[PDB]
Symmetry: D2
Subunit: 440 residues, 4 copies
């Protein structure tokens, strides 16, 4: 699956729709980023610039100009073609091919931006600009606005009003289109295939990083070159660290391993967590914690639908957790009191769900305590977990256990669609999968 | 192989040896680096800070203070321990364990650096600081020096002399120790195993990125999690782009594929290029260009030794190239004239060799036109190539061919040691390897 | 005359009137300014901050908050009282006395501004801020807006809309109130008395700076301590330099001297230019140029009224100038052609009039080529001049003559009021004045 | 008196003498400084740049290059000549006339500095630069050093060593030459004449600012256009504020008035304080405090000579003060105990002496607690004072009295020369002077 030329067009028009007449929106590309000395990390475009262009170069600026309610046009600034730079660092779109390729009306050299941008903003009332996003962008925009302010004698005037387009653009990104859902559907399949493979390959004596290698190879083979975030492979006590990425330890028979990993496919993030026994067999103590987390997930998957909220479902998960923990003697006392005292917090200290999209922790307003009413098109994670510290004052068998199980869902008209259910999570199915792999 | 506590100690003492009495050297850690929104790229420590510490955290500063010719001490600034931050983002060394772990005399909280650094520089004559390396570092150092300048009434004085330690430190890094050579020896084996695997897996119909996936999996399985630079898989005309990293095309029967890839093992870079037929069989036209590049490499490997230079060997390679190209009718005229006119430059437009170490394009002074006399302990690449543009005015059969063959070497007492010869480069051996893999 | 507490109040309310509901306006004080090392120039408050407060301290910020159409309040940030700092550098208002003294609702320590400002902007829709005016202000405002943007989990939100208040505030300053006109009326008297005195004291052999001294002493004695701009005393050829401030030459019998000087009285600028003979007697050649400039001024003073413009009156002055210059043989040809060719420009190369107020070159929109229709309450200069270069190709007797005559006026219902006519400008009256003084 | 071409030359050569071979010193001009909107304060050159050039323009940089022990040359960067800018803002030296006028070897356009400076520093070992002095300078220098660092392939190299020239240059400025002493001698006469005049003009009912006006007029008439610092006229309780500059109160019969004022003559500061009765007659209570301050000054003037220090003389002044104050019942107890308890500090809370020169608070190292041994050529103030707060718990008659008496001296071979003794300070001589003036 992919995002069409026409979809990028629709998104631009939808932003322009909400802009005031006599205004310009300015969307800047991500800078290149040093890894060490003269080497650079693989380039990752700014999500918002990507959202409106599908253009994967730095030193580019999309300018959307609205003259009035029926008249608007687009100008791209981008790198000029250069035989020497391209022989070295790779091909460039340039100005000639850009109008057709990206569906913009006009394209100019990024090197001319300081000589051209102020002319585009001259006489407008409003400029939409994400102030503070990138320092190089602020310099360019402030420089342009100063020329206009001080150019009274050359009959120049600056827009007096500057508006942050991020609330508007992020509200758009919060609701996925059918094309976006298809792309995320495939991201979820790819990511699920990766997690299935990690389960199948896992043996005692392998290092945590080895499963990272298997996962990244599986991402890559389906055309998802990069992860959406740094892969987490926390075996044993490392599972109690939420974003453990060292992945440096030998995996030991008897421990669990928690894998949080997600591919990036056409810009969109998968995000799956699966926890399982390194030796393919859950112990009683591991099952007892796992079952609480799994019931939390399974109940949440039944509940999530239009009209409820992350806050409301989180409440049901807390009840399930506190009850499970009391029955095991990890918590003591009255359930309803313990809930009122948030007694679960030492063991479940993060949110149940975050938005998912072009960013793994996606943009969009949550409301107070994530109380926003869910509607169809929202995409989010469901990721309950229990993390019992090595030194927690609880029965010994539970100490040093970290379990999280995470699925990705899209809210539909009547409920939700699970994008990541193709990788197993019921303990018996995990055990069958690993047994089958060990024969073969 | 690894770098010992004692080696890090020796390096610090060797820097201190060259510092003036009454001075302090300040070495700063790399900042964390955003990939998109709140996600960050895998952390890569500054090479120079790593060189003196083997410490892989940000927000850290090594301060080496020389009182006189026999008295010196070290102070580390580093992140404080924090239960909440560690439950989330992973374990931290802290101040207590740092003296023993990293062999420094004292360790303070990075959060106290503005209250403590000026006290450490007070009354010194000289401060060694890499001005411009990182903006956050300059702010901290300038802030400290200003307090001292303006603190006359509190009996404070600033060092009047600031010296860049990069020439000195980079001159040290240019000469590898036995431990460093062992680590690079292993980086070369790992990288070679990766390139061998890519050759064995390559089939027509696979995409360039698939070989990237095989290479990264092989790096990872030997404990080299990250590449030293963004992997290059240029098939067909993409081979004529020196740093082609899109790796997005279907590999076609009949084309060559050029792979430039290198692992990062304990901080040190491997860097290998191998070019080969996608279908396992070189054509006449491909052999004719390949043989010129291979003779260039093989001759360079015979020549490199103490007493010569990159410039001098490059001269021999130019002769070999210009002659080969004349015999094929790609160049016309007298060899010696064509050499004097640098007629090879449209086809070989980069240097033969760069320094290799903690950075793939390593630090250290080359001399004018890379004329520096080679000595034992220097580590460098040997990477001749020929790149015939798709539109070059040459016989049709050579158009769109890009071939590079790259090995990594260390200069020894009597010649050089090739760290990357475990992956084949003679065409007959490449063909046998791919045939053998295809049976299976 | 002075500006009342109630007037400052009215101005704030008039700004608040035009602000959107759910917004805050932020007006910052001028920074202190180094003259050399640890000495500072006499403090000059930002005109706009002064306009709304009459408060003469740095490190102060006026915040006007509009909740809705009938509810608003004001918060001042200002320096805290400090016995040590006040024993040294002078008294401070502080927080306790500020509400009553400056008519604001609340006053907080400037040192707490970063901990308090974001709380004041939290939940608002719009912030009015003069972006780029002062770097220290931008840092404070951007810092506040970032806290809000990133404080989603602490239920903070930033205003998405930022509006420059300078167009609005400067449009207010363009129309003077009765109190402002009374203050400028007195500034004009004081400035006129200064120019009269300079004429009376001038003798051949005195230096240009001596008349500067007489002028500044006269400003000071009526309570106008500082000039509104650096005084210009250009004798001889120095009169051809528009903003000659070196004032370093001996004044010579036979030359003219051009004095452009203006006091600053309660913040408001006077701005007068008078040119006269150093020896008290105009020559024929000097009269011939002077009379053209004087007719230009006198005609402009008759013409200026509501309904015309600076552009339109400037047209009449050009006609007068071009005709005068043709009759003297300084220009040759047809008057109407020479006008169409702007042939006057080598001799009159500046505008006839600028706005006058809290700044000598006052704020307010001029329109294209200063075409804005004049209305009652606008205050402006009338300053025609002719400057014949020492090397101009014109009859010798005119070379090196610089003459300007400048009055300050306020547009009234039926015409204008001249605030500076108490110093003479008709040549016979100048000569009588200087003769009378010489007896003284 | 003035500073000769040859003296400026000598100073440059004396700096060059102390510079390392293979180095360049960079000395930058002061920026222009806004007073309000588009008006600027009178330009004041950076003292150190002035010290080596006598050049009074901004956008200028002196570069002194030392190749070796007998070879050096100078390059000036300065504003280019421009007919339009000069017709407006005044004459400019330009490049052609600068070598001869300022005795430099070469002169280039300031607008070309970024294209030329790095070429001047290329291949040098050391650059002397006052880091942090001006941001515009740091940008220019860092920009130049970065080009060199990164220009290895263009055979460029940066000096690795940067040295602050301010300690060296300020140590030079601490010792005045005969020409400098002559100029300061005249600054002291001019300043003294001003203070004499203020005493003669003072009447009850005049405002503090009126005496400021008389003082500035007297500075101006002897060719000292600007004060060296903001004039202080503190009558009554305002005399207890050390740097009272509001000068806004009516002077009242019965009060004292403290005047601290100093001219700037050819760059050099006078600095005199005289305190006297507004009505020309000291009261008993005023005499009792005045006599202690005067004995302090007179004793200090006898003591100051080579071999002593500011610290040592300050000790004698403390004894005199503490004794005087005990005899009046302002302090109670044993003198030697009260000295040991620094009991004088509530009444004398500043230093006795500061260096004087191109800055009123001149550059140069004081030593701990101003213990530096005095030598001939040092120029300094002697300014004891007693300031009894309005609310001090002391006999009523002393409350609200502020008295300071300040003279300027140069240390000679055998003692000191008083540059400011031409204005009276013995109370009987003050009273005679004011009586004589009143007849006016
Ligand atoms: Mg996750
Ligand atoms: Mg997640
Ligand atoms: Mg256990
Ligand atoms: Mg390579
Ligand atoms: Mg290489
Ligand atoms: Mg071909
Ligand atoms: Mg004027
Ligand atoms: Mg004017
Ligand atoms: Mg003449
Ligand atoms: Mg003084
Ligand atoms: Mg003083
Ligand atoms: Mg009294």
């Amino acid at each position: 699956s992919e995002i069409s030329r026409q979809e990028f067009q629709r998104r631009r028009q939808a932003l322009v729709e909400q802009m005031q007449p006599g205004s310009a929106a300015l969307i800047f590309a991500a800078p290149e980023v040093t890894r060490s000395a003269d080497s650079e990390y693989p380039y990752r475009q700014n999500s918002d610039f990507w959202y409106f262009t599908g253009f994967n170069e730095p030193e580019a600026v999309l300018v959307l100009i609205k003259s009035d309610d029926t008249h608007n046009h687009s100008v791209l600034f981008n790198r000029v073609r250069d035989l020497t730079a391209e022989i070295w660092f790779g091909r460039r779109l340039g100005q000639d091919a850009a109008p057709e390729k990206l569906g913009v009306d006009r394209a100019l050299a990024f090197s001319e931006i300081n000589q051209q941008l102020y002319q585009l903003l001259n006489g407008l009332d409003v400029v939409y600009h994400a102030q503070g996003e990138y320092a190089y962008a602020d310099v360019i925009v402030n420089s342009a606005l100063e020329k206009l302010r001080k150019g009274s004698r050359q009959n120049l005037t600056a827009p007096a009003t500057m508006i942050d387009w991020r609330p508007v653009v992020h509200e758009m990104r919060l609701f996925k289109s059918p094309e976006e859902i298809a792309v995320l559907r495939r991201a979820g399949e790819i990511t699920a295939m990766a997690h299935t493979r990690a389960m199948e390959k896992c043996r005692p004596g392998m290092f945590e990083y080895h499963l990272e290698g298997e996962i990244h190879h599986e991402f890559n083979r389906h055309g998802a070159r990069y992860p959406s975030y740094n892969t987490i492979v926390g075996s044993g006590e490392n599972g109690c660290i939420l974003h453990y990425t060292e992945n440096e330890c030998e995996m030991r028979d008897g421990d669990l391993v928690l894998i949080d990993a997600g591919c990036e496919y056409k810009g969109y993030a998968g995000d799956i967590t699966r926890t399982f026994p390194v030796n393919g067999k859950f112990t009683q103590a591991q099952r007892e914690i796992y079952d609480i987390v799994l019931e939390s997930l399974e109940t949440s998957l039944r509940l999530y639908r239009p009209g409820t909220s992350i806050l409301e479902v989180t409440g049901e998960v807390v009840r399930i957790m506190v009850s499970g923990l009391v029955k095991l003697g990890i918590l003591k006392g009255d359930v309803d009191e313990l809930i009122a005292q948030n007694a679960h917090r030492p063991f479940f200290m993060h949110g149940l769900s975050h938005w998912l999209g072009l960013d793994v922790h996606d943009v969009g307003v949550y409301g107070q305590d994530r109380s926003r009413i869910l509607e169809p098109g929202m995409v989010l994670t469901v990721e309950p977990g229990l993390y019992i510290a090595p030194d927690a004052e609880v029965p010994e068998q539970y100490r040093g256990i970290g379990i999280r199980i995470e699925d990705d869902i899209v809210i539909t008209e009547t409920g939700n669609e699970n994008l990541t259910a193709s990788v197993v999570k019921k303990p018996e199915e995990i055990e069958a999968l690993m047994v089958a792999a060990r024969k073969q």
